């Protein structure tokens, strides 16, 4: 599924991501925009052989099991395929653990390079939330 901006903002709120670990909803929507372009089916192969999955491009190196990332962990205790669902619950639950890991949203390199310090409120501007 390809969400609209305000539609994803609403789904993220419903799933308790708004202000989670102090990151406003705009921070989560901006991250999703540049990670997946709001596409829940996005997959991208990393040079190390890990894969990134879903709206927030969660990496098989640490967080999900895809069966093909040697030496990896599965800290969200999920198949990486559950991160490709039109229902964002699994991606949200696993993003909550990632952002709690110590480096906040710097874990998403697209967030650090493209969202951090910007007017992230623009991402939720005019949304009925
Ligand atoms: Na893994």
Give a structural overview.
The protein has 129 residues and is mostly helical. It has a single domain (1-129), classed as Lysozyme, CATH 1.10.530.10. The protein is built from four helices and three strands. It has helices at residues 5-14, 25-36, 89-99, 109-114, and strands at residues 43-45, 51-53, 58-59. A three-stranded antiparallel sheet has the order 1-2-3. Helix 1 crosses helix 2 (25-36). The protein is globular, with a radius of gyration of 14 Å. It binds sodium ion. GO terms for molecular function: beta-N-acetylglucosaminidase activity; identical protein binding; lysozyme activity. It comes from Gallus gallus (Chicken). Keywords: Allergen, Antimicrobial, Bacteriolytic enzyme, Disulfide bond, Glycosidase, Hydrolase, Secreted, Signal. Its EC number is 3.2.1.17. This is Lysozyme C.
What's the SSE blueprint?
Blueprint: H1 5-14, H2 25-36, E1 43-45, E2 51-53, E3 58-59, H3 89-99, H4 109-114
Antiparallel strand pairs: 1-2, 2-3
Helix pairs in contact: 1-2
Bound molecules: sodium ion (NA).
Sodium ion (NA) is lined by residues 60, 64-65, 69, 72-74.
List keywords for this structure.
Lysozyme; mainly alpha; 129 residues; 3 strands; 30% helix; lysozyme activity; 3-stranded antiparallel β-sheet; binds sodium ion; 4 helices; globular; 6% strand; bacteriolytic enzyme; allergen
């Amino acid at each position: 599924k390809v969400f609209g901006r305000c539609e994803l903002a609403a789904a993220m709120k419903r799933h308790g991501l708004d202000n989670y670990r102090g990151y406003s909803l705009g921070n989560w929507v901006c991250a999703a925009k540049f990670e997946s372009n709001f596409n829940t089916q996005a997959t991208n192969r990393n040079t190390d052989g890990s894969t990134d999955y879903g709206i927030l491009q969660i990496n098989s190196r640490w967080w999900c099991n895809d069966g093909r990332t040697p030496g990896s962990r599965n800290l969200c205790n999920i198949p990486c395929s559950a991160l490709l669902s039109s229902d964002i619950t699994a991606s949200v639950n696993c993003a909550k653990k990632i952002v709690s890991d110590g480096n906040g949203m710097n874990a998403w390199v697209a967030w650090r390079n493209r969202c951090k310090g910007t007017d992230v409120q623009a991402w939720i501007r005019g949304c009925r939330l």
